[PDB]
Amino acid sequence: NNELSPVALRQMSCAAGTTQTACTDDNALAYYNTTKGGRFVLALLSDLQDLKWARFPKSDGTGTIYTELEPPCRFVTDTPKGPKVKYLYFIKGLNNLNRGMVLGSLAATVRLQ
């Protein structure tokens, strides 16, 4: 019985960027893993369909960093309230284990068809 993420994750907050340049103050959303280490967000989502890099804020003072993305995969991601399209880019350089925990949490515990 090898189970993926036998304990769930939490946290959703802050922003990221859409224009490598812009990321003015509020672009897209970051998802999960405060990450014991400190802060390591596993995955990213968006209400839009245009995001090249993302200056996602982080702890300390040098929190600014280019948390860029890669070719996405979109889902219907039906909100309980109603339908809403959301394109899921993954953090550049994620490994197959983390993309398993993320997918397991936001699909099996959320309303997706």
Binding site: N1, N2, E3, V7, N96, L97, L103, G104, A107
Partner: protein, 311 residues
């Protein structure tokens, strides 16, 4: 009675399958087998004891017992609907063992059964545990995988020091006869991982769910996503298997002219020394879903923990 011989007739079906019971009636069968566990309570690669499975062997027309076992499993009812909505998607891959889901009258209820058709007696985790935890006074599981697959005979274990590499160097030839059973169970993992990605299934691949033919069979801890994005997690399957890929000399059919163990050897150019485009094609054929950069020439590596990985 007739409530026992009816089970032997419902386990069968469209196939011929002249089965013989092994669990004394409609009861299960207890075995001691190797497993790879991780479930918030336990973790490790250890020999545990199984109790939820009834085994039925199979005899051919000449009425001789062959290597074919139907392993019907009793479990909860929410597993039944979940291992049938993931099997109905991964049923067209030729590297998946046939399943049969039904409901039977045990005593006073309708209890559900899941039957896997034509497995082998042992898994790939039983063969890996046997060669990595060797005891020369407790090696019954290894002296059977070696005789069932015509690697040696039962009179080979009578000579003393038959397990020794320095006194009997002929044991490296009895081990090398498992190299094509292991090489063909490496090509079926890459088919299963491809079929598991096109359908949207996410799950961890462990070696006790692939019998000694390459067929896969527990789909009870897998989740479902949108098709096209599936993530086979193969990291304790390849790593635990690695020491057996050179002991059994698995990739000795790659030296032949069509990867055929019958056709003659490949005659290479004598002035050739690079072999980088064939090193990157051997990684793609057998280790396709191993997610980490592989540098054939370790002069392009990134630290001393990458040199050790890529060498």
């Amino acid at each position: 009675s007739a409530d026992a011989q009816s089970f032997l007739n419902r386990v069968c079906g469209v196939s011929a399958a002249r089965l013989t019971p092994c669990g004394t009636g409609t009861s299960t069968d207890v075995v001691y087998r190797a497993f790879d566990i991780y479930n918030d309570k336990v973790a490790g690669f250890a020999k545990f004891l199984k109790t939820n499975c009834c085994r039925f062997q199979e005899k051919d027309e000449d009425d001789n017992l062959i290597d074919s076992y139907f392993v019907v499993k009793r479990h909860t009812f929410s597993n039944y609907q979940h291992e049938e909505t993931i099997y109905n998607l991964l049923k067209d891959c030729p590297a998946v063992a046939k399943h049969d889901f039904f409901k039977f009258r045990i005593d006073g209820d309708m209890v559900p059964h899941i039957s896997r058709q034509r497995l082998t007696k042992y898994t790939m985790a039983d063969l890996v545990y046997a060669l990595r935890h060797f005891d020369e006074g407790n090696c019954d599981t290894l002296k059977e995988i070696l005789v069932t697959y015509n690697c040696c005979d039962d009179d080979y274990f009578n000579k003393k020091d038959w397990y020794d590499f320095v006194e009997n160097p002929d044991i490296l030839r009895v081990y090398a006869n498992l190299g094509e059973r292991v090489r063909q169970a490496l090509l079926k993992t890459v088919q299963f991982c491809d079929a598991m990605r096109n359908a949207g299934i996410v799950g961890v691949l462990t070696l006790d769910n692939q019998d000694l033919n390459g067929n896969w069979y527990d789909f009870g801890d897998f989740i479902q996503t949108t098709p096209g994005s599936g993530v086979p997690v193969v990291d304790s399957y390849y790593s635990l298997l690695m020491p057996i890929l050179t002991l059994t000399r698995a990739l000795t059919a790659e030296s032949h002219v069509d990867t055929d163990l019958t056709k003659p050897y490949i005659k290479w150019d004598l002035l050739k020394y690079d072999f980088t485009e064939e090193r990157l094609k051997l990684f793609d054929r057998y280790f396709k879903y191993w997610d980490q950069t592989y540098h054939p020439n370790c002069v392009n590596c990134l630290d001393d923990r990458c040199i050790l990985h890529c060498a």
